[PDB]
Structure formats: structure tokens, C-alpha cells
Design a protein around this nucleic acid. Structure first.
Length: 61
RNA sequence: UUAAGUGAAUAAGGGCGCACGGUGGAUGCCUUGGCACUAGGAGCCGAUGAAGGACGGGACUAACACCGAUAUGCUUUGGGG
């Protein structure tokens, strides 16, 4: 959801950031080659990256 | 039978009236926009980068809207069920 993000330190924040990046790259490729039953995840990953970034923003000033 | 005289009707096509269609959108009714004002708010925006724009953002994306690499959306405080 939203609250589990607030628990982790800045290290885990950047970790999950890079992990979501990689997942987005894989979703991108597997789009072009006729796959990905559940395409509604291409929203979730971008929105989660957004949430992580803003929550990071509010802490660092 | 001869002779003299009289002489109707038919339409290649056209006129008039009637009856039935075809093109064309007047007229009848109607409003999704306008016009002129009344009362009240408001009367500036900009080097923290303006007005206005180009390019992009969706499973599909040609356009219009909204958005901006956090891109058809992020956080929080109230409403709603």
C-alpha cells in the first residue's frame, strides 16, 4: 500500500527503486513479444516508484 | 352500273386537366450556443524564468481534452458511501 514504504530507511528506498526499475524494463520487453497476460501492472510499478520518490522527498527537507 | 354532290374515324408527335412518384430543402415545431444588462468578488503576471507554444504520456492512439521523464498522474486535510 502506502504505509509499508514509510517503515524502511533510505537504503531500502533506493534498493526498491532499482528493483522496480528492472521490473519495468522486463515488462517493457515482454510487451513487444506477445506476452504479459496482466498488463495492468505497468501502472502499478510506475505509481509505486512515484510514491517512493515523493515520500523520500518529504523526509529530505 | 354510271353521274353529280356531301363526307365521318384512326396521331410519328404535341396541348389542357386530373392522378402518382423523383430530385431540393422552404416552411411548422425544437435547443446543445449567443446578445444586452443587474448585484457581488476581483483588478495584474514576471530572473524562484512569465504570456504563448513545440515535443511527449494510455493495451490499442489519428484528433480534442488533462498531465509532464514522479507524464490519463504523487502526498495530506475535510466532504461522500
Amino acid at each position: 500500500k502506502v504505509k509499508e514504504i514509510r517503515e524502511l530507511t533510505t537504503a531500502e528506498m533506493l534498493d526498491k527503486e532499482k528493483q522496480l526499475k528492472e521490473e519495468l524494463f522486463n515488462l517493457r520487453f515482454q510487451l513487444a513479444t506477445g506476452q504479459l497476460e496482466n498488463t495492468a501492472r505497468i501502472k502499478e510499478v510506475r505509481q509505486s516508484i512515484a510514491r517512493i520518490k515523493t515520500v523520500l522527498r518529504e523526509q529530505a527537507n
